[PDB]
Hints:
The structure holds 4 chains of a larger assembly. By secondary structure, chain A is mainly β. The first copy, chain A, has a single domain, classed as Lipocalin. The first copy, chain A, has strands at 5-8, 14-19, 24-30, 40-46, 57-66, 71-83, 89-98, 109-117. Chains in contact: A-B, A-C, A-D, B-C, B-D, C-D. At the A-B interface, strand 4, strand 5, strand 6 and strand 7 of A face strand 4, strand 5, strand 6 and strand 7 of B.
Amino acid sequence: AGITGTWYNQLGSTFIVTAGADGALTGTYESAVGNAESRYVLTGRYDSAPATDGSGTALGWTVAWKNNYRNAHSATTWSGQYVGGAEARINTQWLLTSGTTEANAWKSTLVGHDTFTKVK
Amino acid sequence: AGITGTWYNQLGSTFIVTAGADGALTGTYESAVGNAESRYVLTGRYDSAPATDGSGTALGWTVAWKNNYRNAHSATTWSGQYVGGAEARINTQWLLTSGTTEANAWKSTLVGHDTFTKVK
Amino acid sequence: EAGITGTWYNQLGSTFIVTAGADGALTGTYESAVGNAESRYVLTGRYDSAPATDGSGTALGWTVAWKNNYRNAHSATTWSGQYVGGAEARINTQWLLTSGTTEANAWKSTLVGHDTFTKVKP
Amino acid sequence: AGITGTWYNQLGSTFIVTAGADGALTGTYESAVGNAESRYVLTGRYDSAPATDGSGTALGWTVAWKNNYRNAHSATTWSGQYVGGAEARINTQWLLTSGTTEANAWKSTLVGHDTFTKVK
């Protein structure tokens, strides 16, 4: 499957994941600094039987930005695909929703993209 | 938390979820038809200690579209917030990524918005 | 024919007046429900001027940069969607608002949402 | 403004744009992907008086995918910012909506991200 392990995004945020045999993703997400106060639980799912035609392996995961140290009252989901080989990558787009009042709900959600690599 | 229960989106797709003490979301997602072939595992995260200022509760979850009957080689993440009160609602935006070759990756990801309530 | 020219409202009452040109152009203004001049901005976009005849909607999109003579938010929004005809005509959209940021803050430059418009003032 | 010119995205699509003094963007777009041939008209807007604090210049534009050669019954909008630097760049995210039936509207909209430089 090639997904289990440590991954690094374009700015060095660190995605630590186990791809279980049942299609589960479990792990932690943290900043490039690597300090414990920046580390959060993640969970998600992946395609455990992907195509063997050069297509990527679809996956997604969520972090709610609450840990024992802080709480941003927000959650990010990453949706994307793992691409194997000598240029291995996880290519994602993400949605970060903050808890808001209804009056501020129109501006609750940020969107962006993250590309993860196996080396920093 | 108010999140545990059976929810329906605007097209009747059915989200059966449990919100655990630790911030975990677990459950299943299926079509309005309610047939076993359309039912899939989900996992996610939510803010287990939301603000007390009238803001919503941030959350997200993932389904990989593989079960014992079908594999679409794709995964969806929903990112949103739970809004409590008279009529509880979960307002989300979602990203559905299909596994693609690199040449087709431009058309890998659909986006939309789902609103869930506890009534069909 | 196209059904798009005129005034559209979301449920919060933000309002746009648009002309759908025979050339595929969209031109008009976007404003708040209050309708004061400080809230009104130039809108420009494009639509499919020869849509399918199979019951499909009409694809369209437009941009507003949030600068006018009275304010500048240093940002722009694009709405991408489709027009759906009938007595309760609707424009169903999703949108992206990008704010000018430094590179360090670029990860948080872009909001996403959805807007549905109808011809009936709320 | 720095915006006026010929730009290319990461896939080699060609974005030929003029930034008018009135905040207008006009020009043509030639797509390296999809149901597309030759140039398509674009129009959009940009911030003609950007902040002077090091921030980029917000802008957006639309292409409806109809020209004299073909009609994909769809439209893309790009929302982003121009980043003046050593190597000027326009970083965008985009939404491509197809005209669909109501039953297919859930899968009407693709999302992605394009980065443009004046060097191909």
